Amino acid sequence: EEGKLVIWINGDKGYNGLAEVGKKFEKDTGIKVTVEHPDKLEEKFPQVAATGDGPDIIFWAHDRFGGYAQSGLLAEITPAAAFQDKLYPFTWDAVRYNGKLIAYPIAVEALSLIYNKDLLPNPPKTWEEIPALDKELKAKGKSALMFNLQEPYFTWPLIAADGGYAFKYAAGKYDIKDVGVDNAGAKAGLTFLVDLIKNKHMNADTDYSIAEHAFNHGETAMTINGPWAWSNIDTSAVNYGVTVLPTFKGQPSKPFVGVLSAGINAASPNKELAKEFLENYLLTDEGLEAVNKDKPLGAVALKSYEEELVKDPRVAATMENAQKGEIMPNIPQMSAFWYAVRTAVINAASGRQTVDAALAAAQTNAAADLTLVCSDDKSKQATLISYPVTFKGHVIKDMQIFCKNGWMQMTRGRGINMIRIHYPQTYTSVVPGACVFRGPYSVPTQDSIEMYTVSVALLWSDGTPTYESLECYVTK
Numbered sequence: 001e002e003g004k005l006v007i008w009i010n011g012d013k014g015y016n017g018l019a020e021v022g023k024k025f026e027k028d029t030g031i032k033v034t035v036e037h038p039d040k041l042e043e044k045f046p047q048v049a050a051t052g053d054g055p056d057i058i059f060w061a062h063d064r065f066g067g068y069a070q071s072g073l074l075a076e077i078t079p080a081a082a083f084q085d086k087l088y089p090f091t092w093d094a095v096r097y098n099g100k101l102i103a104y105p106i107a108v109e110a111l112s113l114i115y116n117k118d119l120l121p122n123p124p125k126t127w128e129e130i131p132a133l134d135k136e137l138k139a140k141g142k143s144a145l146m147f148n149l150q151e152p153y154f155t156w157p158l159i160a161a162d163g164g165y166a167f168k169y170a171a172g173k174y175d176i177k178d179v180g181v182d183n184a185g186a187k188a189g190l191t192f193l194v195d196l197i198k199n200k201h202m203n204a205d206t207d208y209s210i211a212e213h214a215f216n217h218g219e220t221a222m223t224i225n226g227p228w229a230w231s232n233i234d235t236s237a238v239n240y241g242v243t244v245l246p247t248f249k250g251q252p253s254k255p256f257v258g259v260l261s262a263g264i265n266a267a268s269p270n271k272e273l274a275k276e277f278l279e280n281y282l283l284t285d286e287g288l289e290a291v292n293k294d295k296p297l298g299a300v301a302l303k304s305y306e307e308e309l310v311k312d313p314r315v316a317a318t319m320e321n322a323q324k325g326e327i328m329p330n331i332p333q334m335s336a337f338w339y340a341v342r343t344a345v346i347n348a349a350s351g352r353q354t355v356d357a358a359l360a361a362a363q364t365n366a367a368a369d370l371t372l373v374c375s376d377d378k379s380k381q382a383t384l385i386s387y388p389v390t391f392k393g394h395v396i397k398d399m400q401i402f403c404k405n406g407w408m409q410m411t412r413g414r415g416i417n418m419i420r421i422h423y424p425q426t427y428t429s430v431v432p433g434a435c436v437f438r439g440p441y442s443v444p445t446q447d448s449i450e451m452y453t454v455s456v457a458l459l460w461s462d463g464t465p466t467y468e469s470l471e472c473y474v475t476k
């Protein structure tokens with residue numbers, strides 16, 4: 001709707017403060033500003049913006065914006081040099097996609113270790129110490145650590161500590177072909193997490209609100225969270241510190257660093273109003289103050305403000321953790337990475353898959369966009385799903401699936417491609433066209449399980465071949 005600004009931002013952010021900024025905007029321009037916090041908005045935005053609908057402005061960490069830009073959902077930003085100089089350059093670099101500025105950077109985000117000083121004056125420096133510490137607190141009616149296990153954002157710092165990575169950065173770009181989900185380091189880290197759960201130091205079902213409640217009411221000595229979380233702790237009775245994440249196998253935990261960013265919907269008729277709102281209301285000492293006061297932003301992108309923020313030790317700790325991590329890629333393939341790791345962590349933590357199997361499925365999903373939906377019952381068939389998210393640059397051109405009975409080609413277009421995979425011995429005769437698992441194979445680790453597998457050959461646009469396999473496991 002023209003003559004009005006609609007803003008979407010995550011419900012864990014400073015939306016009331018931004019609303020107050022919006023009030024400051026309406027009052028001067030007569031233009032009403034409505035701030036909303038849709039659920040799973042990072043998914044809902046590309047859905048509705050694609051229909052020409054949605055907000056004028058969308059706020060999210062920069063990693064999602066490359067996908068948005070590739071789908072044509074974001075207007076190009078062209079700020080003056082003067083405005084550009086007001087913000088730190090690396091924050092601008094975070095919002096650049098295939099050459100163009102696709103958003104306004106706002107603040108730099110990283111997870112930190114947050115601890116209750118009255119329970120735990122000297123918090124552990126290593127993950128390895130948490131079990132012994134938990135045993136001591138449990139006797140006192142408390143627990144050592146609770147944090148959100150449902151979102152891979154929070155568990156990634158540990159998985160990445162021993163060598164896990166999303167995409168390798170080489171020769172001036174992310175190498176979409178070199179995916180780090182499945183390696184020895186990632187396995188060691190996720191195994192440590194799963195072991196914390198097996199040993200009842202953490203609970204697989206723990207989510208954001210459970211961990212927030214447990215920490216802010218004094219039940220658990222530590223939590224892992226970002227700056228947005230500090231204001232609720234300020235309200236609580238907890239005297240807290242914000243410090244460096246614990247090390248794992250002697251290496252720093254490596255949080256993925258986000259830059260909170262504001263994109264303008266390409267379909268918005270209101271773009272000039274959105275630009276002026278963002279530049280002359282939101283990014284100002286006053287506006288950033290308003291939002292930061294409602295819920296802290298971390299290290300803001302605005303130079304004038306940063307100088308006052310660097311004095312807040314919580315922000316300093318934030319930047320200390322950021323320096324030990326890595327800025328998130330913004331490439332479209334990140335959406336497949338995050339989906340794949342979310343599934344792996346949830347499945348490993350619950351005990352539905354082993355760490356090795358979970359990561360192996362995650363690796364293939366993040367790298368090749370292939371998901372295999374297994375059935376516990378052999379008589380019900382598996383489904384292989386191909387769902388490409390990257391349409392530009394180095395991409396898989398050709399895909400061949402190796403099934404027990406031969407090779408079959410599978411195309412990559414924008415859309416979704418699904419085939420059934422049959423377990424062998426299931427059909428009384430050979431079914432024309434059907435892809436059949438190789439197996440059953442033994443699994444040395446677990447004696448009660450049978451493995452089935454198919455293989456895949458990938459031909460990249462540059463001629464590079466690569467190979468994947470996908471497994472399903474079944475109880476005998």
Ligand SMILES: OC[C@H]1O[C@H](O[C@H]2[C@H](O)[C@@H](O)[C@@H](O)O[C@@H]2CO)[C@H](O)[C@@H](O)[C@@H]1O
Binds near residue numbers: 010061151153
């Ligand atoms: O969990 C995967 C998720 O991680 C990041 O989302 C963060 C976000 O950056 C923070 O600002 C805060 O809101 O917490 C989110 C996790 O709940 C990625 O930005 C996102 O794309 C990804 O799906």
